[PDB]
Each structure stands twice: as C-alpha cells, then as structure tokens.
C-alpha cells in the first residue's frame, strides 16, 4: 500500500543513467512500432498478388501474356517488399539490443549505488533504532527488496514502452487505414473480456471447493494418523480405511462435476473468442464485396488492431514490476534518508587530548526503547576518579549494565548528563569517544577472520609486534601459539570453536590494542568456567592500572581490590565506599555477600491406470481429431483469402465467402464437441485413479507397524501432505498435459502433411527455419538461468558479510570499525557490479538475435514464397496456408516445453508413491496367519526381554526383563522413570517384537501368535485418550470391531465406566458428538469413555498406562474408582504413578535399568526397605 515518488526512486540516476533510459525507451518505442508496420506491408503484398490474381484468372484466353505483365509486376513489387522486410529485421536487431542493454545498464549502475548507500545507512542507525526492529527481517530486506527494485528499473520498462508502442501504433494504423473495422473489432472486445472473466469466478470458487472437499477426507486421515496407536490397538484399520474410502468417493464425484463444468466453460469461451474474430473477418468480407476495402487492407487493420489489443495485456506485467519496485524502494529509501541524532559517522564534536578519565554521572534518568512501560533508572549519581576502578553491584534489573551502555553513548539519557572528564559526552565526537573507551562484554564475539585480524579490529594500523604484545599482555599468547597456524588461525560460528575464557582473552587483547583511556567491563567474568576465570581475571587486572575503569559483575571475587564499590536498589544508588565500610553499613552489599557465601521410467503407475482401458482411447482419438481440426481453420482462412485473391470474376465470390464462414462455424462447434469430450474423459480418468491411489496408499500406510510411525521423517502432517501431493501430481501427468501433447502433435502432424504436399520445398524451407529460432529461443533461456544462478552465488558472499556485520552489530559499533564492513561490502559488491555490466550486453544480444531470427525468418517465407516459387506456376493461396499451418503447428509444440515440469514433478511424486505401497512391515496386522487359541484364561510371561527402540538404539530401556502374572490378579508396575514401565504394555500389544528374549501369554509366544487376535484380548487404556469425532456410542463401540455392538452392550460399558451421569445428562445422550468438533468435555469423561470402549471388548487383559496422568481433585477419585472396579475380574497391568492406589495390588514390581529389581506384595516390599519403600515414602510425605 505505501509507495514512492517516481523521481526519488531514480535519485541515483544522473548524467549517463538518464541518457541510457532515454535512448533505451526510444529504441524500445522504435522496436514496438516495427511490428504493426510489418503487418501493414503484409497487406501491400496481398494487393500485388490480388491485382495479378484477378487479372490472371480474368484472361482464360492468353497464357504467355500472363507470363509478362504479371511476373514483371511481381518482380518489381516482391523485390520491393522483401527489401523493406530485410530492413525491418536489421532495425529490430539494433533497437532490441539498445532497448535491453541500456536499461539493464542503468539498472545495474543504480542498484550498485542503492546497495552501497543502503548498507551504509544500516550501519549509521543508533542502537535505540535496532532495539525496536528485527535484524533478520532487515537483512532479508537488504537482499530481497533491492532485487525487487532492480526488477522494476531494468529492461522491464523498455518492454513496457515497447508494448505501448505496439498498442498506439497498432490502433493508429488501425484507425487511419480504416475507421470502421476497428470500431467493429472493439465491439467484440467486451465479449472476450467477459468470457475470460467467467474464468476468474469459476476457478477461484471451485479451487476452494476441492480444497474444501479433500479437507473433509484429509481430516479423517489426520485424526486417524494422529491416533494411529489407538486404531492399531483396537484394530479399526478396516473401518478407518472405509471412512477414508467413503470420503474419497465424494471427493471424486465433486471432481467429475468440476470436470464437466470447467470443460464446458473452456470450450464455450474458446468458441465465443473464435466466433468473435470470424465475425470481424466475415464482416471484413462484407466490405470488400461493396468495393470499400481492399482484401489486403482487411488484413492490415485486422492484424494491427488485434496486435495492439493484446499488446495491452503484454504490458500489464511490466506495470506491476515497476509498481512493486516503487513500493519496495519505500522502506529502503526510508532508511537511507533517515538521519540520526547520535550518528557516529559524523565528523563533529571535540576530540580531547590528554584525557585523564574523570567520569561522573549526573541525575541520570533513562529508559530503554520499551519506553513508558518501564523506567529502569530513577535518578542517579556516580563519580569515578581517574585511575580508580569502581565496581557496580546489584540484585537484579541490571541497571548496572545500563551505565556502560550510556558511557559509550549508545543511548542518550532522558534527563541528566554523562561527563567524561569535565565535558558532557555529547560534546565529544561519538567515534573518538568510543575510541577512548575499551569494552569487554559478557558474551564475547569474534569475527570470521584470523586472530591477527580480530585483533586488527581493535586498530586497523597495527603490526604483528603489537598484536603479539597485546595477546602477551593478556596472557593469551601462550595458548594460541600451541594452536596450529599461529596468528593466522580461523574463528567464527563456523570452524575452530574455542574455549570461552580464551575467546574473552582475545577480546581483551582486541580491546587492548585500542589503548583506551576509559575501560568498561560488563560481567566479563560472569558465565565462565572457574579454572579459566582466573586466567582471564589476571589479564583484566593487568588490563587496568593504566586506566580508569567501571566494572560490573556478579563475581564478588574481583570486587575487593576495587577502590570503590557501588550498590543499586531500584535504579537508585544506595551504598558506596570501600569493601570494609559497606560491611559496616550492613546494607545491600553485605546482604549479597552472605547469600552467595529419482527420475526413472515408472510404467506401473500407468499399469494401475490401465484399470480404465477406455476413457483414454476416447480422449486420445478425440484429441487427435481436435489436433487434425485446428489447422483446418487455417486452411479455411487460407482459402477465404485465397479464393478472394484468386477470384477473377467477382460474381461468384460473395456466395462463396458465405459458404466458408458457414463451414468454419460448423468446424468450431465440432471442435467444441471434441474439446468437451477430450477434457471430460481425461478428467474422469484422472479422478478415479486419485481414489485408487489414495485408497491403496492409505491402506498400505495402516499396514506398517509402530516402528514406522515413530520415525522423525514421518509425522502426521508430513504424511497427510505426502498423501495429498503425490496423488494430485500423478493426476496431472496423465491428465490435461497428455491430452494436449497428443492434440498438438496431431495438430502439427495434420498441418505438416497438408503444407508438405501443397507447397513443395516451401515447407522444406520453413522446417529448416522454425526449429532454429525455437532452439535459439531455448538456449537464450538456458543462458538466462545460468546468469541468474551465478549472480545469486556472488551477492550471497556480500550479503554474508552483511549478515555478520548487522547480527553482531552492537559489538562492532562498540569497537567502531563500521567503515571496515562498508569497504568489505563495497569490495564484495564490486564483482557483481562488473558482472551486471556484461549482463546487459548479453541480454541485449540474445534478445536482439531471437527477434532478428524471427524477422529474417519472415523475409525468407515470402522471398522464397515469391520469386523461385511464384515465378513457377504456383499459388499464393498455398503460401499463406503453409505460413499459418506451420507457424501455428510450431507454436502448439511450444506447449510441450511448458508441460515438461508437470511430468517431472509427477514422476518424483510417483517415485515415493509406488514405494510407500510396496514397503512391508515386520509386524503386519493384515496377515491372517497365526494360531487363534481357543482357551480363554490369560497369563503373561516376560522372559529375559531386552528391548531398544528402533528410533533411538542408544540408551536401552529393557535389559533382561522378566515378569509373570496369573489370571485375575493385578500386576503393579513401578519404575524409577521412563517407558520401562510403559514398554511392557507396548510389547504385549506387540507394537514391537523384542530384540532378545521372548514374551508369552497362555504359554504361546506372541511372536508366533496371530497379531490381531492377540491385541483383540487387550483392554488398553493410556494417559491421554483420543476420541474420534462421532457418537460417543461409536467411540465406545470402537472397543469391539468385526461386529456391531448392541446399544445395551455399549450401555453396559458406560454403566461400568461410571460415565452414565454425562451420557444421560446430555440432550442427545449416546448420539452426542465428541472430538472438539461437535462437543467438548473434560478429560475425566474422555477417560471414562476410553474405559468403556476398553471393556466393551470384554478383554481378559486390562492395560492401564498412567491412566491418572492428567487429572485433578475429585476427577481422579472417580476415575480410579472406575479402574479399580474394572480390574479384579481380569488380568491387569497397572503402571499408574499413584502408589497409594497401588497398595491393594496382588504383585508390585520395581523396574531398574530394564531389569526387575524388587517385587512382592505391598507390605512385603514395605517390609523390605529399598526402592519401593523409598517410592512410597517420597510421595506420601510430599
Ligand atoms: Br473464416 C476464419 C477462419 C479462421 C480465422 O482465424 C483463425 C485461425 Br487463422 C486459426 C484458428 Br485455430 C482459429 C481462427 Br478464428 C478467422 Br479470423 C476467420
């Protein structure tokens, strides 16, 4: 919404840049004007053949007499028109180079200045300006927004003026050559603008319906693939597939309806557009029979107007490119034009010599940019005598850290003054002030260069001697010399990450080359290891003694030797003095001392598509007919002008043009019929395989075991995405792109034959010219993409050192050295600058060539079409036919290169979709094999079980686990932590087979048992029960599948679960909908329902996995009261964390490092004193 003045945007264009754009836009207008003139000559060539075509047939008496005056007229006329033609091609060759080169030249020159001025402006802002902004968005604003500006001031403006030239020039030649046909052509324009306006309303409203249609199926997939362990445990994998298959069945019905209506729309609009033209052209014929327009003049206006009409559309993108570049330049120039109060680039203010360093802070009130919300310094008073070292102490707020901020004048104070020596800080030059102030901050930062360079960031003029004495005076010399490569080592976020106490020591050495008169040490010892803290602290004490120093830390070790100590309370300075006096005061300081003491040939995807042997042959045969039918419109147009030029006697003409215009309309409707058929067949053929694919994928997805769903690669979102994308993509490859790719090869094929058998060698010539201008058009785009990737790689190096400069900014400005990053950025940009100059010459050459190759190609079409061809007993009516046939057949092959990525993007989406079906699990619930024992009573034997999780085979959970539990008794499961308590329940559900050892139930190893039948006897209840969106009766009936559960049966379980108070209280009762779609209830009710579905199954085994995890107050007392009643009649395993509710258990087992450690009844483990006694004691006392 915000934008920029047009002149301010070009403020960096001066002298030559203003000229380049002028010559550029000039040649751009010359370029545009060239085309409607080229079509104007196409009319004069018609009248030459028409004056001879009428007189050649007017004879029927003399033959050799027509070999003289006709051929002479043709000789003088065709050589004239061909000479003019060769002239236009040389013109476009020059102006197209001038057009693109000059504009790209002005673009590159300015963006170089923009980028330099922009980065210079970024470094000029004061710190308060950064505290209110996002540096990441700013740096992306530096590289992205400058690109948008370049796109708008580049050759796009030349294209814009070239287009308006065609538009004006087309309608000038239109109006002058004929004021009637133009008004007629404009009269049908609203119909064309109205038919394509039905497209913007149908697409935008139906693209939502499909994104709404699958959103109903993808919601099933989401709540399924999120609750996968629950459907796996309850075996609803046939139902959850059925529901998805039922929503897939609706999405395909809405997809064929959209296929019916959209193909009805596309054909009807195409028929309206082609009927609109043919009326304007048949109207053209109605004015030649009246001797008011020449048959060649009808063409000149009909082409020039339609050319200029579409030139409007071909200019609209360049308008948006310029406008976006304006609005992109707003926030950029706003930074360049913003002027600071602090500067630091300013050459102003005093530079005191012999600074003795007597600092004082006077009545300083301050607040950081969070402004009226907080005021961190309510008044202040502090002097620090020269040579002395004052220490600032404080409980919190870190108003301590604020004085160092003000002392460098990173901010100016709200009220009061900071005075270095006797002068106010604001009277001294900002840069010189920061140069007489050395800073060592808590988190030290080193830039990605050599140590000597990072030390060189203290002072640019320095020799390895001073670097050596600096690091040796910080006792940082001993440890870097042992490091390889000496001073030439590397540091940064990338490479050679060092110890913190060593980085701080380089920072002290960096600040030491500064030889500052003032020193500020902010928590430089804080947050550092204890051993190296002394190594650095010795350098700090050796860094002072020559300077006046303010130091802030929470280490009361460094503070004793300070000549003065200062305490803060609420931004108010409270206590000050030597260490002993503060202890005698027994105030804030004394208080704190005591406290601290693969693209491949995939045919099988088409073999699945072979489910429909028809519907394809219908469309292909229909598309090839439509292919063969398109050039027949060019044949008609050829003979509507052909018989009109080859007329002779004029009486028969008027009756013939009516017959032709009639047949064309019969051919257009027969094209509409074959277009609605080739679009509906492919549409319905691609919609059913979308169901088959999403069905077979979602089926195979439910086949995999919990091992697969645990993968970080496969999350519920990444699976639904993989589920939607791959299925839609393969529909496109077998969809419209194929029907079109066959219609077009049929369109060229049926066009090439007609042209070949008519004009001999005429076609053989055009087939030499067209593939070259097409390849030359392709190679230009390859060079275009090559130049694009290269410059992206080069400015990336510049923006990389821009990222470093602005992300670590508050440090660089503390060290000054901002001019350094400017020059580095300038040198980095100097390569893309000289690159951008060559770009203009390249872009201009390629564009001018592809334009010249099209115009010279046109000259070859007629100079050969006349002369050698028409000096033969030939037919001009054929030369026009081969032009339209071949050129349109070629431009229809131009659609092959556009649908090429639709094939690759689909094969890649097919690559994953064929493997996701074929991948097989280790535990497949689908296998019907397995024993299915007949004996009811349930035991469980864990024997020597070692288990590791396939995602994390590092820390083991189960090592040699061994349990046993008889029928009808409760096995309590206590654990120090982790899923060692929970993995038991997962292995019994056989979510995994154990690595070593085995687990039996009735004595049969579950590994040889039937996987589904096994889980069918298990009453799993977990921490967070997930309930799908449906009737609670259904969430309950989910406990028993392969059979519909009775109402009184799901009542009995709801009675059992003590949830009946809700189920009757509701208005809908058992038919109420749950799942945060229809209704919402608290967790206690959700769990009771999960208990109900658990025992709707009537299992012989309950599995209560911390069932009271998330619960509170009376809700726990009522849920535990339901679980306690659900067991005692069944085999049970309870890992619940309530050991008070575990007291009445038949056997309590303590898990330790995967081994069983203690086990026995409650009082038995209470008699022993150890882990279980400690577990019961710790949470009964607390
Ligand atoms: Br009659 C007649 C035939 C083709 C005409 O232009 C074309 C041409 Br040329 C090709 C195709 Br496809 C469709 C149309 Br409409 C005109 Br205008 C009038």
Author numbering: 30 to 626, 689 to 1273
Per the authors:
The multidrug transporter P-glycoprotein (Pgp)/ABCB1/MDR1 plays an important role in multidrug resistance (MDR) and detoxification owing to its ability to efflux an unusually large and chemically diverse set of substrates. P-glycoprotein (Pgp), a member of the ATP-binding cassette (ABC) superfamily, is one of the most promiscuous drug transporters in nature and is capable of binding and expelling a very large number of substrates from the cell. The structures highlight a high concentration of aromatic residues in the transmembrane α-helices that form the DBP, many of which are directly engaged in contacts with ligands. The binding mode of the environmental pollutant BDE-100 in the DBP of Pgp was also previously captured by XRC and it was shown to be a potent inhibitor of verapamil-stimulated ATPase activity of the transporter.
A close inspection shows that the Phe979 side chain in the other structures appears to be just outside van der Waals contact distance with the ligand (not shown), and therefore it does not appear to contribute much to the binding energy. BDE-100 binding to the F979A mutant was indistinguishable from that to the parent C952A mutant, but the F724A mutant lost BDE-100 binding at site 1 and gained binding at a third site (site 3) that was formed at the pseudosymmetric axis of the DBP. Furthermore, we detected no significant differences in the binding pose of BDE-100 in site 1 between the Y303A, Y306A, C952A or F979A mutants.
